[PDB]
TrEMBL record:
It comes from the Eukaryota. It comes from Aplysia californica. The chain holds residues 66 to 165 of 515 of the full protein. The lineage of its organism: Eukaryota, Metazoa, Spiralia, Lophotrochozoa, Mollusca. Residues 1-95 form the BTB domain. It is found in: Membrane. Coiled coil: none annotated. This is Potassium channel.
Amino acid sequence: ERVVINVSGLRFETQLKTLNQFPDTLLGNPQKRNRYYDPLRNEYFFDRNRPSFDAILYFYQSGGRLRRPVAVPLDVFSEEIKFYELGENAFERYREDEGF
């Protein structure tokens, strides 16, 4: 199944398997992502920061590689990874990488 994730108008597509390899995340848990399902357009809608989602999706496609885009502020991205509940293990690699 093809999944469409609409972030403030910017649509991303990926395989259901891709998101499910990380079941303890918002997008990897049907019970959590379904709270954002748009019945009208058959897609998941997130009224959030667009430039950050690129790094969020690549996290899944890369197997866990969490890299903040150079153009996205540290405080913004941190909020995003937190909202998508990427996990402590990844939030650590992220902190060491950023400095704190």
